[PDB]
Amino acid sequence: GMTEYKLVVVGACGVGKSALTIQLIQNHFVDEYDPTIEDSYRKQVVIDGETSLLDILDTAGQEEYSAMRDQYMRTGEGFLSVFAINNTKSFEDIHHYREQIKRVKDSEDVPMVLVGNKSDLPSRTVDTKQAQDLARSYGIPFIETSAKTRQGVDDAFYTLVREIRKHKEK
Ligand SMILES: *CCC(=O)N1CCN(c2nc(OC[C@@H]3CCCN3C)nc3c(F)c(-c4nc(N)cc(C)c4C(F)(F)F)c(Cl)cc23)[C@@H](C)C1
Ligand SMILES: Nc1nc2c(ncn2[C@@H]2O[C@H](COP(=O)(O)OP(=O)(O)O)[C@@H](O)[C@H]2O)c(=O)[nH]1
Ligand SMILES: [Mg+2]
Structure with a gap:
Protein backbone atom coordinates (compact mmCIF):
# COMPACT_ATOMS: atom_id res chain seq x y z
CA GLY A 1 0.00 0.00 0.00
CA MET A 2 1.03 3.64 0.31
CA THR A 3 0.61 6.72 2.46
CA GLU A 4 0.78 10.37 1.44
CA TYR A 5 2.51 12.96 3.68
CA LYS A 6 2.10 16.72 3.54
CA LEU A 7 5.51 17.99 4.71
CA VAL A 8 6.29 21.67 5.17
CA VAL A 9 9.78 23.21 5.02
CA VAL A 10 10.05 26.39 7.13
CA GLY A 11 12.84 28.69 8.24
CA ALA A 12 14.36 32.06 7.49
CA CYS A 13 15.16 33.38 4.02
CA GLY A 14 18.27 31.83 2.55
CA VAL A 15 18.78 28.86 4.83
CA GLY A 16 18.24 26.54 1.84
CA LYS A 17 14.62 25.37 2.01
CA SER A 18 14.25 25.33 -1.75
CA ALA A 19 17.65 23.75 -2.42
CA LEU A 20 16.85 21.05 0.14
CA THR A 21 13.44 20.25 -1.39
CA ILE A 22 14.80 20.22 -4.95
CA GLN A 23 17.69 17.93 -3.89
CA LEU A 24 15.21 15.54 -2.34
CA ILE A 25 12.88 15.61 -5.32
CA GLN A 26 15.21 15.77 -8.36
CA ASN A 27 18.61 14.73 -6.88
CA HIS A 28 20.55 17.81 -7.81
CA PHE A 29 21.52 21.12 -6.25
CA VAL A 30 19.92 24.35 -7.47
CA ASP A 31 22.03 27.26 -6.27
CA GLU A 32 19.93 30.21 -7.51
CA TYR A 33 16.25 29.61 -6.78
CA ASP A 34 13.95 32.62 -6.73
CA PRO A 35 13.48 33.48 -3.02
CA THR A 36 9.84 34.45 -3.66
CA ILE A 37 8.63 31.18 -5.24
CA GLU A 38 6.39 29.17 -2.91
CA ASP A 39 5.18 25.82 -4.24
CA SER A 40 4.68 22.15 -3.41
CA TYR A 41 6.86 19.43 -4.90
CA ARG A 42 6.07 15.71 -4.99
CA LYS A 43 8.25 12.65 -4.55
CA GLN A 44 7.47 8.94 -4.32
CA VAL A 45 9.92 6.92 -2.27
CA VAL A 46 9.88 3.77 -0.20
CA ILE A 47 10.53 4.38 3.50
CA ASP A 48 10.87 1.40 5.84
CA GLY A 49 9.22 -0.67 3.17
CA GLU A 50 6.15 1.46 2.46
CA THR A 51 5.60 3.59 -0.63
CA SER A 52 5.50 7.17 0.60
CA LEU A 53 4.17 10.01 -1.53
CA LEU A 54 5.77 13.15 -0.12
CA ASP A 55 3.93 16.39 -0.92
CA ILE A 56 6.43 19.02 0.25
CA LEU A 57 5.49 22.67 0.75
CA ASP A 58 8.59 24.85 0.21
CA THR A 59 7.60 28.02 2.01
CA ALA A 60 8.57 31.46 0.76
CA GLY A 61 5.75 33.98 1.13
CA GLN A 62 5.92 37.09 3.28
CA GLU A 63 5.25 36.69 6.98
CA GLU A 64 1.44 36.90 7.15
CA TYR A 65 -1.03 36.02 9.93
CA SER A 66 -4.40 35.82 8.13
CA ALA A 67 -7.01 33.16 8.77
CA MET A 68 -6.37 31.89 5.23
CA ARG A 69 -2.62 31.64 5.78
CA ASP A 70 -2.96 29.97 9.18
CA GLN A 71 -5.39 27.44 7.76
CA TYR A 72 -3.08 26.58 4.87
CA MET A 73 -0.02 26.08 7.09
CA ARG A 74 -2.19 23.95 9.37
CA THR A 75 -2.52 21.38 6.60
CA GLY A 76 1.10 20.37 7.17
CA GLU A 77 1.40 16.96 8.79
CA GLY A 78 5.05 17.55 9.69
CA PHE A 79 7.50 20.41 9.55
CA LEU A 80 11.20 20.75 8.83
CA SER A 81 12.56 23.62 10.95
CA VAL A 82 15.53 24.65 8.81
CA PHE A 83 18.42 26.91 9.78
CA ALA A 84 21.87 27.36 8.21
CA ILE A 85 24.91 26.53 10.31
CA ASN A 86 26.68 29.75 9.29
CA ASN A 87 23.77 32.04 10.17
CA THR A 88 23.18 32.33 13.90
CA LYS A 89 20.06 34.46 13.33
CA SER A 90 18.34 31.71 11.37
CA PHE A 91 19.17 29.45 14.33
CA GLU A 92 17.56 31.84 16.85
CA ASP A 93 14.57 32.24 14.48
CA ILE A 94 13.77 28.51 14.85
CA HIS A 95 11.78 29.24 18.04
CA HIS A 96 9.48 31.58 16.11
CA TYR A 97 8.66 28.89 13.56
CA ARG A 98 8.11 26.27 16.27
CA GLU A 99 5.81 28.66 18.12
CA GLN A 100 3.69 29.50 15.06
CA ILE A 101 3.30 25.83 14.13
CA LYS A 102 2.17 25.06 17.69
CA ARG A 103 -0.27 27.99 17.55
CA VAL A 104 -2.09 26.99 14.37
CA LYS A 105 -2.03 23.32 15.41
CA ASP A 106 -3.19 24.10 18.99
CA SER A 107 -0.94 21.17 19.93
C1 LIG B 1 13.49 34.49 1.49
C2 LIG B 1 11.99 34.33 1.63
C3 LIG B 1 11.61 33.18 2.54
O1 LIG B 1 12.18 32.10 2.46
N1 LIG B 1 10.61 33.36 3.44
C4 LIG B 1 10.26 32.21 4.27
C5 LIG B 1 8.93 32.41 4.96
N2 LIG B 1 8.98 33.60 5.82
C6 LIG B 1 8.45 33.66 7.11
N3 LIG B 1 9.04 34.50 7.96
C7 LIG B 1 8.59 34.60 9.22
O2 LIG B 1 9.18 35.42 10.09
C8 LIG B 1 10.25 36.26 9.61
C9 LIG B 1 10.88 36.92 10.82
C10 LIG B 1 11.10 35.96 12.01
C11 LIG B 1 10.07 36.39 13.05
C12 LIG B 1 10.03 37.89 12.83
N4 LIG B 1 10.00 37.97 11.37
C13 LIG B 1 10.33 39.30 10.87
N5 LIG B 1 7.58 33.91 9.73
C14 LIG B 1 6.91 33.05 8.88
C15 LIG B 1 5.81 32.33 9.36
F1 LIG B 1 5.46 32.50 10.66
C16 LIG B 1 5.11 31.47 8.54
C17 LIG B 1 3.91 30.80 9.12
N6 LIG B 1 2.86 31.62 9.04
C18 LIG B 1 1.68 31.27 9.59
N7 LIG B 1 0.68 32.14 9.44
C19 LIG B 1 1.53 30.02 10.25
C20 LIG B 1 2.62 29.17 10.35
C21 LIG B 1 2.48 27.84 11.07
C22 LIG B 1 3.85 29.57 9.80
C23 LIG B 1 5.02 28.64 9.86
F2 LIG B 1 5.96 28.95 9.01
F3 LIG B 1 5.61 28.56 11.05
F4 LIG B 1 4.70 27.42 9.47
C24 LIG B 1 5.48 31.34 7.21
CL1 LIG B 1 4.56 30.28 6.22
C25 LIG B 1 6.57 32.00 6.71
C26 LIG B 1 7.31 32.88 7.53
C27 LIG B 1 9.74 34.74 5.26
C28 LIG B 1 11.11 34.84 5.91
C29 LIG B 1 9.85 34.58 3.74
N1 LIG C 1 27.01 25.83 0.35
C1 LIG C 1 25.67 25.68 0.39
N2 LIG C 1 24.88 26.61 -0.14
C2 LIG C 1 23.56 26.30 -0.02
C3 LIG C 1 23.01 25.17 0.54
N3 LIG C 1 21.62 25.22 0.49
C4 LIG C 1 21.36 26.37 -0.08
N4 LIG C 1 22.49 27.07 -0.44
C5 LIG C 1 22.52 28.40 -1.04
O1 LIG C 1 21.94 29.32 -0.10
C6 LIG C 1 21.14 30.31 -0.78
C7 LIG C 1 19.70 30.19 -0.34
O2 LIG C 1 19.21 28.88 -0.67
P1 LIG C 1 17.66 28.76 -1.03
O3 LIG C 1 17.33 27.32 -1.24
O4 LIG C 1 17.22 29.80 -1.99
O5 LIG C 1 17.09 29.19 0.40
P2 LIG C 1 15.57 29.47 0.89
O6 LIG C 1 15.37 30.96 0.86
O7 LIG C 1 15.54 28.87 2.29
O8 LIG C 1 14.67 28.79 -0.13
C8 LIG C 1 21.42 30.08 -2.26
O9 LIG C 1 22.60 30.79 -2.61
C9 LIG C 1 21.71 28.58 -2.32
O10 LIG C 1 22.50 28.20 -3.43
C10 LIG C 1 23.86 24.18 1.08
O11 LIG C 1 23.53 23.14 1.66
N5 LIG C 1 25.20 24.52 0.97
MG1 LIG D 1 13.13 29.34 -1.40
Whole structure:
Protein backbone atom coordinates (compact mmCIF):
# COMPACT_ATOMS: atom_id res chain seq x y z
CA GLY A 1 0.00 0.00 0.00
CA MET A 2 1.03 3.64 0.31
CA THR A 3 0.61 6.72 2.46
CA GLU A 4 0.78 10.37 1.44
CA TYR A 5 2.51 12.96 3.68
CA LYS A 6 2.10 16.72 3.54
CA LEU A 7 5.51 17.99 4.71
CA VAL A 8 6.29 21.67 5.17
CA VAL A 9 9.78 23.21 5.02
CA VAL A 10 10.05 26.39 7.13
CA GLY A 11 12.84 28.69 8.24
CA ALA A 12 14.36 32.06 7.49
CA CYS A 13 15.16 33.38 4.02
CA GLY A 14 18.27 31.83 2.55
CA VAL A 15 18.78 28.86 4.83
CA GLY A 16 18.24 26.54 1.84
CA LYS A 17 14.62 25.37 2.01
CA SER A 18 14.25 25.33 -1.75
CA ALA A 19 17.65 23.75 -2.42
CA LEU A 20 16.85 21.05 0.14
CA THR A 21 13.44 20.25 -1.39
CA ILE A 22 14.80 20.22 -4.95
CA GLN A 23 17.69 17.93 -3.89
CA LEU A 24 15.21 15.54 -2.34
CA ILE A 25 12.88 15.61 -5.32
CA GLN A 26 15.21 15.77 -8.36
CA ASN A 27 18.61 14.73 -6.88
CA HIS A 28 20.55 17.81 -7.81
CA PHE A 29 21.52 21.12 -6.25
CA VAL A 30 19.92 24.35 -7.47
CA ASP A 31 22.03 27.26 -6.27
CA GLU A 32 19.93 30.21 -7.51
CA TYR A 33 16.25 29.61 -6.78
CA ASP A 34 13.95 32.62 -6.73
CA PRO A 35 13.48 33.48 -3.02
CA THR A 36 9.84 34.45 -3.66
CA ILE A 37 8.63 31.18 -5.24
CA GLU A 38 6.39 29.17 -2.91
CA ASP A 39 5.18 25.82 -4.24
CA SER A 40 4.68 22.15 -3.41
CA TYR A 41 6.86 19.43 -4.90
CA ARG A 42 6.07 15.71 -4.99
CA LYS A 43 8.25 12.65 -4.55
CA GLN A 44 7.47 8.94 -4.32
CA VAL A 45 9.92 6.92 -2.27
CA VAL A 46 9.88 3.77 -0.20
CA ILE A 47 10.53 4.38 3.50
CA ASP A 48 10.87 1.40 5.84
CA GLY A 49 9.22 -0.67 3.17
CA GLU A 50 6.15 1.46 2.46
CA THR A 51 5.60 3.59 -0.63
CA SER A 52 5.50 7.17 0.60
CA LEU A 53 4.17 10.01 -1.53
CA LEU A 54 5.77 13.15 -0.12
CA ASP A 55 3.93 16.39 -0.92
CA ILE A 56 6.43 19.02 0.25
CA LEU A 57 5.49 22.67 0.75
CA ASP A 58 8.59 24.85 0.21
CA THR A 59 7.60 28.02 2.01
CA ALA A 60 8.57 31.46 0.76
CA GLY A 61 5.75 33.98 1.13
CA GLN A 62 5.92 37.09 3.28
CA GLU A 63 5.25 36.69 6.98
CA GLU A 64 1.44 36.90 7.15
CA TYR A 65 -1.03 36.02 9.93
CA SER A 66 -4.40 35.82 8.13
CA ALA A 67 -7.01 33.16 8.77
CA MET A 68 -6.37 31.89 5.23
CA ARG A 69 -2.62 31.64 5.78
CA ASP A 70 -2.96 29.97 9.18
CA GLN A 71 -5.39 27.44 7.76
CA TYR A 72 -3.08 26.58 4.87
CA MET A 73 -0.02 26.08 7.09
CA ARG A 74 -2.19 23.95 9.37
CA THR A 75 -2.52 21.38 6.60
CA GLY A 76 1.10 20.37 7.17
CA GLU A 77 1.40 16.96 8.79
CA GLY A 78 5.05 17.55 9.69
CA PHE A 79 7.50 20.41 9.55
CA LEU A 80 11.20 20.75 8.83
CA SER A 81 12.56 23.62 10.95
CA VAL A 82 15.53 24.65 8.81
CA PHE A 83 18.42 26.91 9.78
CA ALA A 84 21.87 27.36 8.21
CA ILE A 85 24.91 26.53 10.31
CA ASN A 86 26.68 29.75 9.29
CA ASN A 87 23.77 32.04 10.17
CA THR A 88 23.18 32.33 13.90
CA LYS A 89 20.06 34.46 13.33
CA SER A 90 18.34 31.71 11.37
CA PHE A 91 19.17 29.45 14.33
CA GLU A 92 17.56 31.84 16.85
CA ASP A 93 14.57 32.24 14.48
CA ILE A 94 13.77 28.51 14.85
CA HIS A 95 11.78 29.24 18.04
CA HIS A 96 9.48 31.58 16.11
CA TYR A 97 8.66 28.89 13.56
CA ARG A 98 8.11 26.27 16.27
CA GLU A 99 5.81 28.66 18.12
CA GLN A 100 3.69 29.50 15.06
CA ILE A 101 3.30 25.83 14.13
CA LYS A 102 2.17 25.06 17.69
CA ARG A 103 -0.27 27.99 17.55
CA VAL A 104 -2.09 26.99 14.37
CA LYS A 105 -2.03 23.32 15.41
CA ASP A 106 -3.19 24.10 18.99
CA SER A 107 -0.94 21.17 19.93
CA GLU A 108 2.46 20.70 21.58
CA ASP A 109 3.05 17.35 19.75
CA VAL A 110 3.37 18.35 16.07
CA PRO A 111 5.85 16.18 14.09
CA MET A 112 8.92 18.32 13.49
CA VAL A 113 12.61 17.84 12.71
CA LEU A 114 15.38 20.35 13.32
CA VAL A 115 17.63 20.69 10.25
CA GLY A 116 21.04 22.38 10.26
CA ASN A 117 21.80 23.07 6.63
CA LYS A 118 24.93 24.12 4.72
CA SER A 119 27.08 21.63 6.63
CA ASP A 120 29.49 21.61 3.66
CA LEU A 121 30.67 25.16 4.46
CA PRO A 122 33.67 25.73 6.76
CA SER A 123 32.29 29.03 8.09
CA ARG A 124 30.22 27.47 10.90
CA THR A 125 28.77 29.82 13.54
CA VAL A 126 26.25 27.42 15.13
CA ASP A 127 27.83 24.78 17.34
CA THR A 128 26.49 21.32 16.51
CA LYS A 129 26.25 20.79 20.28
CA GLN A 130 23.98 23.85 20.59
CA ALA A 131 21.70 22.57 17.83
CA GLN A 132 21.49 19.14 19.46
CA ASP A 133 20.57 20.75 22.79
CA LEU A 134 17.83 22.80 21.09
CA ALA A 135 16.22 19.79 19.45
CA ARG A 136 16.46 17.89 22.71
CA SER A 137 14.67 20.81 24.38
CA TYR A 138 11.82 20.30 21.89
CA GLY A 139 11.83 16.51 22.01
CA ILE A 140 12.47 16.30 18.24
CA PRO A 141 15.25 14.84 16.06
CA PHE A 142 18.21 16.86 14.78
CA ILE A 143 19.84 16.25 11.35
CA GLU A 144 22.77 18.10 9.80
CA THR A 145 22.35 18.52 6.05
CA SER A 146 23.94 19.92 2.95
CA ALA A 147 21.61 20.57 0.06
CA LYS A 148 24.78 21.06 -1.98
CA THR A 149 26.34 17.64 -1.38
CA ARG A 150 23.02 15.97 -0.43
CA GLN A 151 24.54 14.93 2.90
CA GLY A 152 21.74 14.07 5.33
CA VAL A 153 18.93 15.17 2.99
CA ASP A 154 17.19 11.77 2.87
CA ASP A 155 17.68 11.35 6.59
CA ALA A 156 16.00 14.69 7.27
CA PHE A 157 12.87 14.12 5.20
CA TYR A 158 12.57 10.44 6.03
CA THR A 159 12.94 11.13 9.76
CA LEU A 160 10.01 13.55 9.50
CA VAL A 161 7.94 10.88 7.77
CA ARG A 162 8.88 8.51 10.60
CA GLU A 163 7.85 11.11 13.19
CA ILE A 164 4.46 11.45 11.50
CA ARG A 165 4.09 7.66 11.44
CA LYS A 166 4.85 7.35 15.17
CA HIS A 167 2.44 10.18 16.00
CA LYS A 168 -0.10 8.02 14.13
CA GLU A 169 0.73 4.77 15.96
CA LYS A 170 0.44 6.78 19.22
C1 LIG B 1 13.49 34.49 1.49
C2 LIG B 1 11.99 34.33 1.63
C3 LIG B 1 11.61 33.18 2.54
O1 LIG B 1 12.18 32.10 2.46
N1 LIG B 1 10.61 33.36 3.44
C4 LIG B 1 10.26 32.21 4.27
C5 LIG B 1 8.93 32.41 4.96
N2 LIG B 1 8.98 33.60 5.82
C6 LIG B 1 8.45 33.66 7.11
N3 LIG B 1 9.04 34.50 7.96
C7 LIG B 1 8.59 34.60 9.22
O2 LIG B 1 9.18 35.42 10.09
C8 LIG B 1 10.25 36.26 9.61
C9 LIG B 1 10.88 36.92 10.82
C10 LIG B 1 11.10 35.96 12.01
C11 LIG B 1 10.07 36.39 13.05
C12 LIG B 1 10.03 37.89 12.83
N4 LIG B 1 10.00 37.97 11.37
C13 LIG B 1 10.33 39.30 10.87
N5 LIG B 1 7.58 33.91 9.73
C14 LIG B 1 6.91 33.05 8.88
C15 LIG B 1 5.81 32.33 9.36
F1 LIG B 1 5.46 32.50 10.66
C16 LIG B 1 5.11 31.47 8.54
C17 LIG B 1 3.91 30.80 9.12
N6 LIG B 1 2.86 31.62 9.04
C18 LIG B 1 1.68 31.27 9.59
N7 LIG B 1 0.68 32.14 9.44
C19 LIG B 1 1.53 30.02 10.25
C20 LIG B 1 2.62 29.17 10.35
C21 LIG B 1 2.48 27.84 11.07
C22 LIG B 1 3.85 29.57 9.80
C23 LIG B 1 5.02 28.64 9.86
F2 LIG B 1 5.96 28.95 9.01
F3 LIG B 1 5.61 28.56 11.05
F4 LIG B 1 4.70 27.42 9.47
C24 LIG B 1 5.48 31.34 7.21
CL1 LIG B 1 4.56 30.28 6.22
C25 LIG B 1 6.57 32.00 6.71
C26 LIG B 1 7.31 32.88 7.53
C27 LIG B 1 9.74 34.74 5.26
C28 LIG B 1 11.11 34.84 5.91
C29 LIG B 1 9.85 34.58 3.74
N1 LIG C 1 27.01 25.83 0.35
C1 LIG C 1 25.67 25.68 0.39
N2 LIG C 1 24.88 26.61 -0.14
C2 LIG C 1 23.56 26.30 -0.02
C3 LIG C 1 23.01 25.17 0.54
N3 LIG C 1 21.62 25.22 0.49
C4 LIG C 1 21.36 26.37 -0.08
N4 LIG C 1 22.49 27.07 -0.44
C5 LIG C 1 22.52 28.40 -1.04
O1 LIG C 1 21.94 29.32 -0.10
C6 LIG C 1 21.14 30.31 -0.78
C7 LIG C 1 19.70 30.19 -0.34
O2 LIG C 1 19.21 28.88 -0.67
P1 LIG C 1 17.66 28.76 -1.03
O3 LIG C 1 17.33 27.32 -1.24
O4 LIG C 1 17.22 29.80 -1.99
O5 LIG C 1 17.09 29.19 0.40
P2 LIG C 1 15.57 29.47 0.89
O6 LIG C 1 15.37 30.96 0.86
O7 LIG C 1 15.54 28.87 2.29
O8 LIG C 1 14.67 28.79 -0.13
C8 LIG C 1 21.42 30.08 -2.26
O9 LIG C 1 22.60 30.79 -2.61
C9 LIG C 1 21.71 28.58 -2.32
O10 LIG C 1 22.50 28.20 -3.43
C10 LIG C 1 23.86 24.18 1.08
O11 LIG C 1 23.53 23.14 1.66
N5 LIG C 1 25.20 24.52 0.97
MG1 LIG D 1 13.13 29.34 -1.40
